[PDB]
């Protein structure tokens, strides 16, 4: 609410723009945040609404020279597909490859010399003293490769250095430009002059330096579309048509009508036909069916849904027509939430991405710096000392005199040099498997949001569970209930009645099923009433019960554990002290009822625990990471659940108020700790911990606290994440190194420095070779879509065999 703005810019090309744009944006005053994405080809600023405005921003954009605007709401999947680059690439390549074949084929024909030539390759034989006939046909060629085929590359270089910076074409333009500058200049000598013999000129490279760059550019577009896979498939999947249907008084079909989603609103009841897709999410009317969403949220069965259940927007339907009322209709459904925190995802730059766009502004000034240094330090050399170059190269040729091979030389190993270079490489390597590894953990229901927790859950060494919601069910079922009071003066009727309508005042997740228990075992679904409602989370309920009525015909009610008793003044015998033990070492817990002081009895309360959790944490031990668990209930309880499961160390008896003073205490000795818990409940422990898991989170992903959503209600999930993001920054820092290695060998290499061995490389072979690793760089990103996802038999296959047991001896408590 702080005048956050998300904007669109278009024209972004090369990996240098994105730290002009951020350093502008941030030097300016008024702004302390603002990061730019190239592949969504987006921006996120955060500013001072008072100081300065949306339009100052556009204006200062426009200023650099960029065409930006604000944020669209559903026109994305262009930007994603990249359509139009790719068709533009191929269509230069295809254009620029008439004048390349013949270039190759009059190279490759001198090279191979035939056994029986018919006049011994004459092709070369001089016309007009200095000018050869073959120099005529390439000059020719050269020249209408330039003035047609680089246009582009000249107005993308004009167009950047009309500022400051300078983009990637810089390189192929200056290359290009002295390629033909300096060939014309000596060819001009050799003329002028009435040589007989004419030099070996440049006017070869440029014919297949562009064919290159086009392949290049068109491959590595092609591979980048590949990435953006999961995205186009989650964005092109809802409905843009709606039947919304009128009930007179009977669900009756009144008439029909189709609408699009942008005049659609909340409660409208819109039907479906077999094998169509939900349009809006909202509540089922009518009908019983069963839908699959493995698109969605990627589990394989497919969940069956009855009148009054949930349905989500792109789920498609498989059985008869269901009438649902709407509930969440354009952004608000689920699908829209996911995508839009997918984009937003790729926002969060980590540290090394901020490194590398560091690295990405001062690369082409670098490169033009080395290939003047390598131009100078050759002519030097060859007129100061010709000894050591004439080493390697002996023959005194009469026809070129050794002046004149040593500025082709030096023109040849500077034009090599930054001809060689790719920015690209270095500057797309790390968003690409970001992408990528976000993507394949969308289509598997891991929901990672931001760049950081990508980073951060690799160096993560401790991961916090919570106990309801989280390792068990959610949903308590009553065990029995024990009577230790009156039983004339106080039934059974009676007491579950009162328990029942003072506990409906509450919405406790524990107390609806007792209420609903009593409801079903008494017979009638009446109540009474509640007054006096005193509820303390973490010290239980005390009320009055009157209209009793309703429900004896077929108080002050205190609910609580002992020191909720204690508090009220109550006593506690020692029959009553471990009447409940039994039933609470067997991991239930058990409540104390107390109407007007009288010890009533006790009622049993138990969850089940998820089977996953035997091995989910059993994995995370395995694993090398540490696990604790936190609850709010009482020692005994704890510590049954924790052997139950397996988990040493446990933070019992934690009241609901601070919950981040464990997680404090924990962080405070310089570890990273990530708590699993359940959502909009455990807020302020998610946002403490540097880590947010939300885990059974269904059609609930737009949770700020936490960094990681999980939508399936899985534990292995968890452990389905971290080694999932290992696996993507590990592909980063690869990523960052075959950018590394090529640049930093491939630099010396067209500098000559290998002369010694004999390895010199023409300015062509520099531009092959630099396609190679652009493709590479996205080719080893698509690897990760190679993930087969664990199922149960996976994990319990390296599981099996060692799983230690554990007694209640070796579990340890909280401190005070």
Known sequence: SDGNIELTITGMTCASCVHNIESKLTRTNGITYASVALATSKALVKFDPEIIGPRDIIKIIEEIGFHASLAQRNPNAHHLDHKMEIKQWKKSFLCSLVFGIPVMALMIYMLIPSNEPHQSMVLDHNIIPGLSILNLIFFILCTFVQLLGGWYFYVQAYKSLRHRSANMDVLIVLATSIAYVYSLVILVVAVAEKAERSPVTFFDTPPMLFVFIALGRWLEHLAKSKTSEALAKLMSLQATEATVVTLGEDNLIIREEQVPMELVQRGDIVKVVPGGKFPVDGKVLEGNTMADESLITGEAMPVTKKPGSTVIAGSINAHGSVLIKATHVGNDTTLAQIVKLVEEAQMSKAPIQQLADRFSGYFVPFIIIMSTLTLVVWIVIGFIDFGVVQRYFPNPNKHISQTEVIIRFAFQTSITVLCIASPSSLGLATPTAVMVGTGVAAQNGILIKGGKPLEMAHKIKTVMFAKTGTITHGVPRVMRVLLLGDVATLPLRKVLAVVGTAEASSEHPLGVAVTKYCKEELGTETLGYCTDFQAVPGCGIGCKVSNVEGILAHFSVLIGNREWLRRNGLTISSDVSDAMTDHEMKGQTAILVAIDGVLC???????????????????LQSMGVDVVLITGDNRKTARAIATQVGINKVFAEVLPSHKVAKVQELQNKGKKVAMVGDGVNDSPALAQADMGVAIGTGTDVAIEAADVVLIRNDLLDVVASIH?????????????????????????????????????????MGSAAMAASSVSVVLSSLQLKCYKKPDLERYEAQAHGHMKPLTASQVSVHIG
């Open 601 to 619: 009895g006790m009622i049993a309360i138990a969850d089940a625990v998820k089977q996953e959790a035997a091995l989910a944490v059993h994995t």
């Open 724 to 764: 999932l993001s290992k696996r993507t920054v590990r592909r980063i820092r690869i990523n960052l190194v075959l950018a590394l290695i090529y640049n930093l060998v491939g630099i010396p290499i067209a500098a000559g420095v290998f002369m010694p061995i004999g390895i010199v490389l023409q300015p062509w």
